[PDB]
Write a protein that binds this ligand. Structure first.
Ligand code: WER
Length: 133
């Protein structure tokens, strides 16, 4: 039952400060512009200890499956090849991506009927809000 309230299909409804977050990460102009338009569906499921998070969109589709606390390889929407670890901390999924000596943290939280996603790179934060699809 670890992630019960995350399971489902979630559609992006709002994005704040995502262009500046992407800039801080190192994403180039064309990817920022096209990625910033998309309204992805984030599909979260659990089978045993394995959590799967898929994002489907116009831009790119992504898929990760993982066990909490166990590092894995990820290819991000912007084509970074990262080493990721996802944990549950106080009921928040905390996703850390490491690559080229850098790090970014993505938190997925249930708040009311929404899924709120906070992305942090150095001093820049972006907030993305998703509704049930
Ligand atoms: C470009 C970039 C740089 C650092 S992170 C990142 C990024 C990009 C996307 C995305 C996926 C498809 C279409 C458009 C953008 C998503 C995403 N996946 N699902 N929804 N947005 C995402 N997330 C982890 C989300 C959960 C915040 N992070």
């Amino acid at each position: 039952h670890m992630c019960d309230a995350f399971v489902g299909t979630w559609k992006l409804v709002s994005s704040e400060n995502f262009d500046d977050y992407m800039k801080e990460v190192g994403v180039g102009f064309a990817t920022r512009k096209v990625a910033g338009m998309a309204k992805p569906n984030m599909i979260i499921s659990v089978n045993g200890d394995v959590i799967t998070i898929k994002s489907e969109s116009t831009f790119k589709n992504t898929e990760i499956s993982f066990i909490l606390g166990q590092e894995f390889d990820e290819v991000t929407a912007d084509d970074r090849k990262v080493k990721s670890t996802i944990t549950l901390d106080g009921g928040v999924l905390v996703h850390v991506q490491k690559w080229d000596g850098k790090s970014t943290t993505i938190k997925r939280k249930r708040e009311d009927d929404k899924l709120v996603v906070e992305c942090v790179m150095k001093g820049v934060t972006s907030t993305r809000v998703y509704e049930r699809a």
